[PDB]
């Protein structure tokens, strides 16, 4: 028959949920965001399209902090990403309250995944429209995860989602091949700036602003912090050199 793509949680004769795939398309329509796991932490980066010079630069932050050690950046429908980040913050607060210890990165990943999978379980709720790359440093070291609107989430050496996800994935594969020992935190920041600058060329019609955060056991003592000032400009210059 027909009509399997009009209601959420409805399995097509193939075994698919078409509304989830449409949400994935909505994600693919979003900007490019990447995460890079280094030897002692993770680095998140995102492109912010400067639709007009009326936008206040360095403001309109896109990377959200969870607890004090988790970083999250979502590609797709930004409001849905904020909803998911708020839910994750509530989950982290609950975990810390009950077990005192801060929530581990895998636990947080599974919480977000179960939330999204529940959102893919009823025809009364729309699937999420954001792919979220998140992670941080816990007692077991660095962790980088990516979660899709289907509720599927995995741990990554490097992850990327958005319009320029393919070029970013190729550059991340190059980085993984050329660095088996692992990247350093600042090297990961420079590579994230480079990959963001390289993926902007797909939509070079309008100028963009780079936003980078990192959580490193040595560089930030395990806390999620926004890369700003001298390091951000250094990464921007590194990328500008790398393009040409």
């Amino acid at each position: 028959g027909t009509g399997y793509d009009l209601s959420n949680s409805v399995f097509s004769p193939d075994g698919r949920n078409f509304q989830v795939e449409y949400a994935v398309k909505a994600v693919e329509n979003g900007t490019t965001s990447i995460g890079i796991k280094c030897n002692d932490g993770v680095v998140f980066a995102v492109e912010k399209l400067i639709t007009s010079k009326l936008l206040v630069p360095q403001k309109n932050v896109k990377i959200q902090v969870v607890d004090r050690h988790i970083g999250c950046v979502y590609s797709g429908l930004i409001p849905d990403g904020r909803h998911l980040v708020n839910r994750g913050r509530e989950e982290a607060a609950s975990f810390k309250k009950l077990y005192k210890t801060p929530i581990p990165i895998p636990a947080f990943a599974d919480r977000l995944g179960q939330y999204v999978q529940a959102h893919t379980l009823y025809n009364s709720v729309r699937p999420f429209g954001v792919s979220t790359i998140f992670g941080g440093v816990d007692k077991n070291g660095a962790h980088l995860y990516m979660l899709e609107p289907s509720g599927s989430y995995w741990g990554y050496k490097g992850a990327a989602t958005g319009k320029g996800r393919q070029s970013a994935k190729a550059e991340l594969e190059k980085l993984v091949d050329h660095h088996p020992e692992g990247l350093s935190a600042r090297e990961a920041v420079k590579q994230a700036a480079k990959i963001i600058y390289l993926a902007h060329e797909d939509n070079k019609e309008k100028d963009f602003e780079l936003e980078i955060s990192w959580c490193s056991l040595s560089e930030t003592n395990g806390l999620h912090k926004f890369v700003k000032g001298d390091l951000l400009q250094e990464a921007i210059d590194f990328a500008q050199k790398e393009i040409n």
Partner: protein, 233 residues
Amino acid sequence: TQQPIVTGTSVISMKYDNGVIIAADNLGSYGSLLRFNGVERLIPVGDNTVVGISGDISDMQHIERLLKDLVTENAYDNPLADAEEALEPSYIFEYLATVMYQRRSKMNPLWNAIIVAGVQSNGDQFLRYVNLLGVTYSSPTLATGFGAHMANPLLRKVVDRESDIPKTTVQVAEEAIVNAMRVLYYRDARSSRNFSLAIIDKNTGLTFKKNLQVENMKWDFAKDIKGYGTQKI
């Protein structure tokens, strides 16, 4: 909480020309038993606020967790958590005071007396008090329990009015605080010789001194006390 179990004794605090000083003993009393030592009752929040809690230690730990959660929540989606949009002492106070008055009104209070001391963004000295009843008052000198009875006269001899705050130096205020701690150790059965002391100066910042001890105690005259009246040997 309807009856305190593990209790924290007095807390003292005063204002001086460039900020505030607060102090409290490190004793957790299980009623009449001096059960726990090294119990820090001064909780720093940021680089401009110290909260001194006296009373039920369980509710004190609850307030510790609440302050940590408040810091974490103020960090959320706030790129200015390091500057203009950081937790001011007045914010932390007003929040704690709202919580205390609510807990009172629900007939399940937090058996505590809290003194919030810090320096605002503009440099002004903030010193205020709340309790299980939600009563709020602010004075150049503030103390809880036996502190309010014994330390307050000594500390007010230094700063009786607001006009005495600009004249009072950090050394004078710290010496007065130490003398008040010694007097409390003299005449408070639930006091401790070990205490902690925080100084919030609008210039120097937050100085937190732990493991301090009461020194220069006068006990020699006890050798001459004999009997209770007519006895001589």
